[PDB]
Amino acid sequence: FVEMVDNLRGKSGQGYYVEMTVGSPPQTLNILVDTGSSNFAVGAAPHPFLHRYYQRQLSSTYRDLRKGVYVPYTQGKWEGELGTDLVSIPHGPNVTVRANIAAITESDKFFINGSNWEGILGLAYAEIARPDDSLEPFFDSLVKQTHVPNLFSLQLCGALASVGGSMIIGGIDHSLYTGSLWYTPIRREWYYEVIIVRVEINGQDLKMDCKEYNYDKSIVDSGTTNLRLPKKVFEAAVKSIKAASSTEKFPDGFWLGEQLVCWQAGTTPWNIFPVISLYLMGEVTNQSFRITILPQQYLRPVEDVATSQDDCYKFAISQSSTGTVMGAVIMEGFYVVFDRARKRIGFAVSACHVHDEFRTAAVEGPFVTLDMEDCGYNIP
Ligand SMILES: Nc1nc2ccc(Oc3ccccc3)cc2c[n+]1[C@@H](CNC(=O)C1CCCCC1)C1CCCCC1
After folding, report:
1. Do 269 and 376 belong together in one domain?
2. Of ligand 1's atoms, which has the minimum distance to the CA of residue 72?
3. Position in ligand 1 atom list of the atom nearest CA 35
4. Which residues constitute the domain of residue 75?
């Protein structure tokens, strides 16, 4: 509803976070909202990059599960002790839940200097929870212990500059989007998986086996900044993007995200960059719809070198070895409904998306698409 509107804050490229309390009495922490993971973890010991932490010994409702958890990732990792405790979301539904909490005791390159978050809130399914799927994810405890409907939605506005947005727990707020909401099935409940059935750059079909678009998997992830495409898809998109923007040449570091591009203030030539469209498998047979983002979405604003004058941007579309990842770049143009009860994901044009007087992000349908089921990938 209304109280929840505007409850999301953050640092550009550092993640969107919500305020939560834990323990009795209530210990306040800022928690990162992550649809790309399934554990509820918080700093539970002093840390150079932490302004505060979870002090388990100060909580009367704290119960030790006497179990441990180890989460290692590409570069770095976190580790901690499991237990339960009461948990609330001050600017969310008026309810208190007993949930699992991983008390982060050790970490390597996990917390980010100046991010303002002290923990993570995984909203994905139990399948990808750590240690195993037996550790009930927090949103699963929410729905079980209360009458909060099994659904939530995200409006990431982003427009280091601080960002904002809103997480609506248990419902939909028509005031956060324009047009109609189009839904695509959640292929399988682990990540928030979907199926891309076609890709177009500047109206031109990327023309390639749709299976390539979901090579390994396609997931909607708020815990990722970029729009990550599988290698082959990436190279094809970057090529198509250069062709459309050809009127102006840019260095190879740009396309690789290794360097930024600057223009005289308020002079960015958006019109030279093309719109991008992802077609998603619909709910009705042989039916698809498309979401369309602008350069205002994939060109993310960064701070220059020393200077501040010019308007500097980094190409926020990067290569992937882990499938298509629809991160903040895709999410910031849309109001996204994570309808867990009806096993689907809704997309509508975001009332806060950044655009101009010529174009606007879009969500359209339906389109006739055959064998969209074949677009999904399966292990050998
Ligand atoms: N959503 C998402 N949560 C994750 C959550 C936790 C995690 O353990 C770590 C992460 C960094 C260091 C040590 C351990 C990895 C994740 C990976 N993901 C995405 C990548 N993002 C990130 O690592 C951010 C998340 C928030 C914190 C900074 C790191 C994946 C999802 C699958 C496709 C590939 C990208």
Report:
1. yes
2. 14
3. 1
4. 16-148
